Amino acid sequence: WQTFRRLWPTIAPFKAGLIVAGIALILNAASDTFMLSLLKPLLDDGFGKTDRSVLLWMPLVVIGLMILRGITSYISSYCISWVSGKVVMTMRRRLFGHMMGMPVAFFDKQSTGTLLSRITYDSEQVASSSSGALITVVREGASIIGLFIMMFYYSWQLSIILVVLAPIVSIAIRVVSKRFRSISKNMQNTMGQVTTSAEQMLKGHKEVLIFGGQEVETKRFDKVSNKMRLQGMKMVSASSISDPIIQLIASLALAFVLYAASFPSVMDSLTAGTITVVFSSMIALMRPLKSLTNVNAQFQRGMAACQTLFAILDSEQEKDEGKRVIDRATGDLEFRNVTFTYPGREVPALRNINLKIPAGKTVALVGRSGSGKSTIASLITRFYDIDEGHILMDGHDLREYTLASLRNQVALVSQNVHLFNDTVANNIAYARTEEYSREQIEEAARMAYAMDFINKMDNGLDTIIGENGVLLSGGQRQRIAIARALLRDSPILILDEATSALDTESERAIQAALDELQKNRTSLVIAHRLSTIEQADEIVVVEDGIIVERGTHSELLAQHGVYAQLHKMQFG
Amino acid sequence: WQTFRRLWPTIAPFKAGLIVAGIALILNAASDTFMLSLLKPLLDDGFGKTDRSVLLWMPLVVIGLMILRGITSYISSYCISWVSGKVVMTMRRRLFGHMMGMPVAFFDKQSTGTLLSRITYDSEQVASSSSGALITVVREGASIIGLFIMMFYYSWQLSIILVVLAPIVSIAIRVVSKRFRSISKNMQNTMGQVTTSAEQMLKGHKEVLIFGGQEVETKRFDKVSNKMRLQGMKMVSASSISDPIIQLIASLALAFVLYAASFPSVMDSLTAGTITVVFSSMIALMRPLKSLTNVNAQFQRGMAACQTLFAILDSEQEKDEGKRVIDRATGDLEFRNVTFTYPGREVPALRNINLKIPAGKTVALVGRSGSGKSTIASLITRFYDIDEGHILMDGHDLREYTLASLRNQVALVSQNVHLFNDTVANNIAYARTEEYSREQIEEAARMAYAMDFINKMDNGLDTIIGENGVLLSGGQRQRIAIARALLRDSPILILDEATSALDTESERAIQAALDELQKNRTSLVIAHRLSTIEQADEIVVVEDGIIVERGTHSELLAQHGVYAQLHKMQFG
Ligand SMILES: Nc1ncnc2c1ncn2[C@@H]1O[C@H](COP(=O)(O)OP(=O)(O)NP(=O)(O)O)[C@@H](O)[C@H]1O
Ligand SMILES: Nc1ncnc2c1ncn2[C@@H]1O[C@H](COP(=O)(O)OP(=O)(O)NP(=O)(O)O)[C@@H](O)[C@H]1O
C-alpha cells in the first residue's frame, strides 16, 4: 500500500499479465507433482517396472513436460516481460511529457543531462522491480505464509520460537531495506551526473580542443565514473552482508529446535515424528525467506526509483493556466508598470516598465547590452509569467488567456537560434502543423532571403541540416529561423536581434522583405544594428533594466539622449 | 577466445576478483557436504541421537554456517560485484576519452544523444555479462563437463545417446545465441534513440512552446519509447521459447533411456543399479544445462554490447598526428592554393585560396553570408585537417606540427559561443591551466569590457553561470567568450564575428581594447560590422567560397569592388 500502492495504479491497466503469469506458475506446480510421480519410482525400482512403466510412460514424460513445462515456461516469460516493458516505457513516457510541461527557469537551473538521465535510467529501474519482484515477493512470499501457518498450530511449542525471531528478522530486514532505497537513490543521481559530464564533453568539443583541457575533462569524468562504480558497489556489498546476517536469525530458530530436541523430545512431545517434520519444515522455510531477501534488494532499487521520479512527476506544472482561448489576433500588445526579476529574491532586471504596441505598428527595443531587451522580449510570451504589474494582449492579461493559444499568437526569432536535425523544409515546417504547403515554405525561405543557398545545396529543402544548424552558416541558420518564424505568420512577431550575423546587403534585403509583410501585423523588433530601425513606428531606448526614451528615429536623434549617443558610435 | 577473448584483456587487470570468487564458491561446496552430514540424520533418526548428536552438534551448525556459509557468501558477492563494477566503469572511461579523440565532422553527423547513450547504457550491459555470466558459464559449465565425462565411459551405451543430442542442443543454442547478440544490439541503438528524442525535447524547450508542437514531440517519443519496450520484448520472448525447446532435446535423450530400460535392461546390462544411476545422472545433468541457457541470454546481451562499442572504440582516431611540437609562436600564418570541401564527395566550399598573415599584422575576413569565412577560420586550427593545398604556421604545415601544441598556439571566439556551467572565473579559467592568477582573469574580464556587469551580479566571477550562458545576456556571454580567449593570450588570435550581439558603444570599447593588445600578436578578425575593420592591416573580401579582394579599408573602398558595395549598404 502507500508509495508501493501509489505505483499499482499505473500497473493496474497491465494486470492481465500479472494474473496470466501467476496461473502459469500454478500449472508448473502441477507439472512437478507428476514429474515426481514417475522419476523416483523408475529410479531404483527401475528394473522392477521394466516393461509397463518404463515403456508406456516414456511418451508421457515428453508430453507431460513439453506441453505443461514448455508451454508454461513461455507463458510466464510471456506475460511477465510484457507487464514490465509496458509499465516502464509508459513510465518514461509520462515523465518526458511532464518534463516539457515544466515551463520557465526549471530548465535554466539544472543540467539537461540530469533530466535526460531520469528518463533513461530511473524508469528502467522501477521496471525490473514491478515485474520479477512482485512475482517472487508473492511466490516466496506465499511460501513463507504457508510455512508459518503450518508450524503455527501443528507445533505450538516451536511456533513460540517463530514468534521470537520472526519480528527480529522482519525488523533487521526493514532497516536494510531503507538503506537499499537510499543507496540506490544516490546511486541514481550519480548515474545522472555521469551523463551530464558526458554531455558537456561532447557539446563542448570545439572548445575542449583549443580549450586546452581535454584531460581536465578526462579527470572530471574519472571522478564521476568512479563515484559510480563505488556508489553501486556500496549498495551491493551492503546487500551481501545483508544475507548472511538473516541466515543467522534463521540458523537461530533452527538451532533452538536442536536444543529442545535433546531435552524436550527426551520428554516425548517431539519424538521421531515431530522432530522430523517440525525440524524438516524449519530447515525448509529458512530457504525461501533467505531468497526473498536477495530479491528484495532489486525490488527496492526500483521501488526507491519509483518514488524519486514519482515525485519528480508530482512536481509543479510551471505551466500556470488561464481560460480565455482566442484564435484571432489583432496584435494589440500592451503592458503597464510591469516590474520583473528572475529567480525570486534578487534585484529586478526590469522595473516599472509601461509600453503599448498597437496592431500594425512596429516598436523597437534598443539599449545597452544588458538592459532588459531580450527579457521583456521573452516575457511577452509568458516564459516567466511576470513579477508584478500588467501585460495584456487586447485588454486581456496573459493570464486571462490560455497559455496554449497565447503562444500560438506569436512568432519568434530568439537572439541565438536553436534548430533541429531534420530537413530545411522541416526546421521551418516544424513551425505549426509541421505540414503546410510546399509553397508557404518555398515562399518563406525566399521572403527570408535564403531560397538561393537552400537551392545551392543539393536536396534543397529536403537536405539534412546540422544538429542545431551545425553544418551551415549561422547567417544561413538565422535566416532559416527567421524563415520558420515568418511562415507561421502570427499577429504578434518578435525578432530578437534577428540580424545578429548577417551579410549587410543580405540584412537589408530581409529588412525590405520584413517591411513588406509586417506592414499589416504587429511587429516588435529588438536589434542592435540601428540601421534596421531608422524607420520604425517607435523606438524604445532602454538602459539598466529600465526604459528611458520612446521616440522616432528623428525625435530621439534630435533629443540627444543616449540613443543619439549610440547612433553616433554607429560609425567612426 | 576471439571477440570474447579480446575482452578478457580489459578484464585481466581485475582477475584477482575472478579467482577469489571462485575459491569462495568451492568453500561453500565443502560447507554443503557437512550440512548434509548432519541435517538428514537428525531428520528421522532425530529421536535416536537425542543427546550426544542433538545437543553437542547444534553449536557446530551455527558455527559451520556462520563462518563458512556467511563469510563465503560475502566473499562471492564481495569479489564478483567488484570485478564487474571496475570493468564497466573502466569501459565507459575508455570510450569517453576515445570519443573526444574523434576530431572533425564526427560530432557533426550523428546526434550527440546516440554517443551519450553508448557510454551510459552500452557499458552497463557488457558489465553484467563479464561478472555473473563468467561465474555461471564456468559453474554450470563445469557441471556439464563432469556429467558428460561421467556418462562417458561409466555407461558407453547411454553415452552413445549424448553423442547424438549434445551436438543438436549445441547447434540449436549457438543459433539462438546469435539472435541474442543481434536482438540486443538493435535493442541498444533503440535505447540510444530514446535518448536523442529526449535530448531534443529539453534542448528545444524554448522552441517547443511557441513552436506549437509539444504534442508532435509527445508523438515522436511514444513511437520511440514503444519501439523500445517491443525491441527488448522481442528478445525476451525469443529467450522464453529458447528454454522449453532445449528442454525438448533434454527430455529426448532422457526418454531414450526409458526406451532402452524396457528392453535393454530386460537384457540386463542396465539392471536396477545402472537404470538408477545412469538415469538419475541424466535427469540431473539436464538441469544445469537448462540453466546455462537462461543465463547465456544475459551473457550475450553484454557480449554483443562489448562488440558494438568494442568496435566504436576500434574506430579511427580522426586525430591524425604530426611530429614537430613548438612552444613559441610568432604568429606567422601562411597558406597557399588551399582548396577545401566538407564530407568528401560534394562541391568545394573553399577553392584555390592563397593568403598570408604575418606576425603582428591584422587580417580581416569579410564577405557574403555564405562565403567560406567561418570555414577557413576553423580550418586554421585543423578542425578538418584540409582538402588539398598547403597551410603552414611559420613555414611548417599544420601536419608537420603536433595537433596538441598547434591548437595551443591559438585563441578563438567562435561565431556562436559555447559555455559551461561553472563560475564566470572558470568559464574564462577553463582556458589553459584552468588555474591562473585572479589577476589575469580580473584583467581579461576588464580588457573585455565585462568586469562591470560581472561585478554587478553578486558573487562576481564566483557566480554560477547558465548551462551554456543561459542565465545572462548573449552579449555578456560573447564578451566572456572573448574574455576566456583573451586571457589564454596566444600568438594567433581568431575572432569569428566576435561582436555578433553587442552594444555598439560596448563594441567599440572592446575594439579599442583589442587594438591595444593585438598590436603585437597576429590577429585574424572575421566580422560583419565593418566598423571594426576600417583600421585592419588588410581586408580579405571573399564571396562564394573564393577570395576576391585584398586591400586596405582605403584601396578596397576606392576600387569599388563588392567591398565598397557592402560598405555602402553599411547604412541608409
Ligand atoms: N536568467 C537570468 N537570471 C538573472 N539575471 C538574468 C537572467 N537572464 C538575464 N538576466 C539579466 O538581464 C540582462 C540580460 O538580459 P537581456 O536584457 O535580456 O539581454 P539582451 O537585452 O539580449 N542584451 P544583449 O544580448 O546584450 O543585447 C542583464 O541585466 C542580466 O543580468
Ligand atoms: N559542416 C559543414 N558541412 C558542409 N558544408 C558546410 C559546413 N560548414 C559550413 N559549410 C558551408 O560553408 C558555408 C558556411 O560557412 P562559412 O562560410 O564558414 O560561414 P560564415 O562565413 O560564418 N558565414 P556567415 O556566418 O553567414 O557570415 C556555406 O557555403 C555552407 O554550406
UniProtKB/Swiss-Prot annotation, chains A, B:
Listed GO biological process terms: transmembrane transport
Membrane spanning stretches: 7-27, 55-75, 144-164, 244-264, 266-286
Protein name: ATP-dependent lipid A-core flippase
Binding, ATP: G367, R368, S369, G370, S371, G372, K373, S374
Keyword Nuclease: no
Catalytic reactions of this protein: ATP + H2O + lipid A-core oligosaccharideSide 1 = ADP + phosphate + lipid A-core oligosaccharideSide 2
InterPro entries per record: AAA+_ATPase, ABC1_TM_dom, ABC1_TM_sf, ABC_transporter-like_ATP-bd, ABC_transporter-like_CS, ABC_transpr_lipidA, P-loop_NTPase, Type_1_exporter
